[PDB]
Write a protein of this length. Structure first.
Lengths: 264, 281, 57, 138, 264, 27, 57
């Protein structure tokens, strides 16, 4: 009766079902966990918000078209405005979190296409001016739940002030490496003939036990159309991709007044 | 420990189908030859010794070339040629950098070696006595020299090495000195959070590891005073990571670097040479 | 203080090491470590996959 | 400070810092004072209602003359750098009247306190270096 | 060495000291606690924010003058805008909390005066129009950290629409009972010759295990000058009263989107 | 030998007042 | 004559020392001495002070 295709995930007051999954990935074979006393750093008693924040938050959906080049988000950035997770994040200097990432995209037995879904530690991307290096604004690096998109062209700016955004060039993974090698990162593929969802469970990954969430994104989430969407009755059709993410084993230190980042 | 031996196997006619899988799962293909052909037994005595991380990184690699001179300097520009300072990094060159960047994080001790060479600037100004060099490691915060003979070179606390020209290349070990639990080769973030309505500039700020990294400064001088003959020197700096651990593998750099970041250059983003046809042997 | 260890074999024994310095950072290369676990990258799946079985059932 | 001078022979520091305050008004002066430490990354506190959201102590002036506020070790990195550095910024220490200082007549209405700093037993330093606090002509 | 006058209270990242206390009150002899399984009601796993919210928050100070008639606050209303406590309160339908209330007022050995400090369960107060009964607006009932003041006169409104606030008449405790009997409620007195602070530890008190914090205040805090402030060199002098309150054993159920109450 | 570890501790409400002292003593 | 002692740990053993000279002044650095007693400077008081107690009673 039980199947690699059928799964339920419950966190807090939220549950996901899927009937066309393809197993699930646990990044680097490691489930998230709380920070042990023998690896701890800040000494204040941490806040562990548990069910208030460790639950599924669904981002705005994006549309997959035959011309789409792909999508990216950063974490914890994408969830910074999400319920009590966002509040705990911004009221504290320090935070750590794992995640369950659930990417959703259904179609029909007559559609075709394949999405690569990658979780990338320290997903540093190229800037869009050749007058400077590493020249990206905080606002452009941290778009929040809207994330960003890839392009198949690189057109760096004429003036440095106008190029302070990512050059998210698809085939170079926005960072000077070939996209065909992205499979070295934890990943699944949503191949429409096979499955309608991808599930990745991510431990906290960093060179530190805990860090400043408002300064530093630990993971990138990349969705690339490896094989273009095609549907014979209407090649211009669009199907939604929906991203739902739950923080896990969240832990925060260094409580004070709330952080309100710059918006422009 | 050795790489895998091959077992003796014949054919099959079976409901067991190891040739098929579903890579949508995130698993790579797993099948081996004995799953899909008849195989003989072959004992494999070969090992993966030379691809351990210690073996892969077990080389001294040149990471920069510095220049210093010794002559009677009468201008500010020429006075600044009597010593040099260099922010310690592996991004001046490409080879070691690319190898390290197979990984997101690392932890290692460092062997540093130096190769020092000289030439005469001209031949009508006599000769020069054998030169002694001082290479001083200046940790972040320690005072940096503004002249080749200022007080900083007394180096009471900073480590210095005094090298005599013609002697064996000098060498020292450096521990793992990171302020985190590993070095980060990539840092997807900033050094501070810019806040709502603050007056701090947001138009000329940077992104990533360059905003947070600081491994101090190497300062080099010729200790000797000037001879009538001007001598120009190069100091090549070599790094070997040892006692190495690494985490979180990455695709390697596919296109030229253009600086300390991950940025790429518009005229150099076409690494593949097109094949004539998909059927080209 | 002397450690005696097997050499890497050549065309056709043991060797001796003594550490001379008080800091481990001064030591020569770490001994060959043949540890590996490719599955953390090649098969990081939650539910075990048996090769001979269907990947999706 | 003595701590500061020692720190400038090192590159890295870690641990908790102790700030002890001695009230030097008259015995007849009373008061309550808020002392706060706000870990970094948010608007620096310039009002009591922001300061009191951080680590803090309310000091009641009285027979025991002195009060200790701790800046506990709260950091992303395992060590901070002994230089001005955004990445290893330490946060903000502030002080406000919780009530006010009150005196009766015939008593000074202005006075002072002294602030002291020292390292806690969890504190250590690394990476010896020359200080920028001493030099000579050449 | 140890003394009834000298106390330290630490909750979360916050500590209070006093050197002129007068013991401390534990209301009805009961320390606060979490909700036991055998008395529980909502069945979702609760959020227990612990140190993020269970810590001392200091309200804006008020000035005690020779003419002051007194001050009131309600709880949890007074803390509704306080850090992570406020966020947890408003993101959930249900909440419960105990409190440590620390009232601070120092002067000199030459000042005199006495404040009664009372914690009142279900502190229902009279409205200010005789055209209606129980006719008080939500906004006027829930002033937040500013609280309200008592008056020594009762002047009900000419029109019902203008009297939708409390008639906080001091000697009737704003509710038709004589103020001299307020001592049946948990209380301390700040008598300037004796002490400079009052400390009251309050358990959750209600006819339910847990309730809607945004609808219902469990406690009133009343500060009444029982003996007027007097200071011979300047009878018009003012001394601050500062109120600092820590939630304790906070527990929340029924997570959803954030409650944003009406402001006018 | 190492620098000091930090013990697990919760809050207090007590006549023990380690936050106050008197540095006049020379301590 | 050889002394074998623990090294200071690095990124990821013991070492051996032999003294070659007849004068101890010739020897390398003294071994790490972690001795300390901050109280002789931080609390040089005649009568014991218990932290939790009043400093002045
Ligand atoms: Ca073998
Ligand atoms: Ca076979
Ligand atoms: Ca199979
Ligand atoms: Ca909790
Ligand atoms: Ca210890
Ligand atoms: Ca004491
Ligand atoms: Cl957002
Ligand atoms: Cl802004
Ligand atoms: Cl010198
Ligand atoms: Cl010379
Ligand atoms: Cl309020
Ligand atoms: Cl409204």
């Amino acid at each position: 009766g039980y199947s690699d295709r059928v799964r339920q995930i419950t966190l807090g007051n939220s549950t996901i079902t899927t009937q066309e999954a393809a197993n699930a990935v646990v990044a680097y074979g490691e489930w998230p966990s709380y920070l042990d006393d023998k690896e701890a750093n800040p000494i204040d008693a941490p806040t562990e918000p548990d069910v208030s924040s460790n639950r599924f938050y669904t981002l705005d959906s994006v549309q997959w078209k035959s011309t789409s080049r792909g999508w990216w988000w950063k974490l914890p950035d994408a969830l910074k405005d999400m319920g009590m997770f966002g509040q705990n994040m911004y009221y504290h200097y320090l935070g750590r979190s794992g995640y369950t990432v659930h990417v959703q995209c259904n179609a029909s037995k007559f559609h075709q296409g394949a999405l690569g879904v990658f979780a990338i530690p320290e997903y540093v991307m190229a800037c869009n001016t050749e007058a400077k290096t590493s020249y990206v604004s905080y606002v452009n690096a941290n778009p929040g739940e809207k994330g960003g998109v890839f392009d198949n062209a690189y057109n760096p700016s004429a003036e440095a002030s106008e190029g302070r955004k990512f050059a998210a060039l698809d085939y170079l993974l926005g960072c000077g490496v070939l996209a065909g090698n992205a499979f070295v990162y934890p990943h699944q593929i949503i191949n429409l003939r096979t499955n309608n969802s991808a599930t990745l469970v991510l431990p906290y990954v960093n060179s530190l036990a805990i860090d400043c969430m408002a300064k530093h994104n630990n993971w990138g989430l990349v969705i690339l159309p490896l094989c273009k969407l095609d549907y014979a009755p209407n090649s211009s059709t669009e199907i939604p991709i929906t991203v739902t993410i739950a923080p896990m084993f969240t832990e925060f230190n260094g409580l004070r007044n709330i952080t309100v980042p710059a918006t422009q | 420990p050795t790489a895998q031996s091959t077992p003796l196997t014949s054919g099959v006619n079976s409901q067991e189908v190891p040739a098929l899988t579903a890579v949508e799962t995130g698993a790579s293909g797993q099948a081996v030859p004995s799953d899909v052909i008849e195989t003989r037994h072959v004992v494999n005595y070969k090992t993966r010794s030379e691809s351990t991380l210690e073996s892969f990184f077990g080389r001294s690699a040149c990471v920069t070339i510095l220049e210093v001179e010794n002559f009677n300097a009468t201008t500010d520009a020429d006075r600044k040629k009597q010593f040099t300072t260099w922010a310690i990094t592996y991004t001046d060159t490409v080879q070691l950098r690319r190898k390290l960047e197979f990984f997101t994080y690392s932890r290692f001790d460092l062997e540093m070696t130096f190769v020092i060479t000289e030439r005469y600037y001209a031949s009508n100004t006599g000769h020069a006595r054998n030169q002694v060099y001082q290479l001083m490691y200046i940790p972040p915060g320690a005072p940096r020299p503004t002249a080749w003979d200022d007080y900083t070179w007394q180096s009471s606390s900073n480590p210095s090495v005094f090298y005599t020209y013609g002697s064996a290349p000098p060498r020292m070990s450096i521990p793992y000195v990171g302020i985190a639990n590993a070095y980060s080769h990539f840092y997807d973030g900033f050094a501070r959070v810019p806040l709502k309505d603050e007056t701090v500039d947001s138009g000329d700020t940077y992104y990533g590891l360059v905003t947070i990294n600081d491994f101090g400064t190497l300062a080099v001088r010729v200790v000797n005073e000037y001879n009538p003959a001007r001598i120009t020197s190069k100091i090549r700096v070599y790094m070997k990571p040892k006692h190495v651990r690494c985490w979180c593998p990455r695709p390697p750099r596919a296109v030229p670097y253009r600086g300390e970041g991950v940025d790429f250059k518009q005229d150099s983003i076409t690494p593949l040479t097109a094949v004539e046809n998909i059927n080209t042997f | 203080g002397a450690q005696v260890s097997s050499q890497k074999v050549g065309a056709h024994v043991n060797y001796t090491t003594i550490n001379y310095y008080k800091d481990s950072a001064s030591n020569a290369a770490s001994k060959l470590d043949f540890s590996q676990d490719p599955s953390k990258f090649t098969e990081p799946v939650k539910d075990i996959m048996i090769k001979t079985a269907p990947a999706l059932n | 400070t003595m701590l500061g001078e020692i720190l400038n022979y090192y590159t890295h520091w870690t641990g908790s810092l102790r700030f002890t305050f001695l009230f030097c008004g008259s015995m007849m002066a009373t008061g309550k004072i808020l002392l706060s430490y706000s870990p970094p990354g948010a608007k620096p506190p310039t009002t009591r209602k922001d300061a009191m959201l951080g680590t803090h102590i309310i000091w009641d002036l009285g027979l025991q003359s002195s009060c200790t506020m701790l800046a506990p070790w709260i950091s992303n990195t395992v060590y901070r750098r002994c230089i001005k550095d955004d990445f290893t910024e330490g946060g903000y220490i502030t002080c406000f009247y919780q009530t006010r200082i009150v005196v009766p007549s015939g008593t000074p209405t202005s006075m002072f306190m002294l602030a002291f700093v020292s390292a806690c037993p969890d504190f250590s330093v690394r990476l010896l270096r020359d200080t920028n606090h001493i030099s000579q002509r050449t």
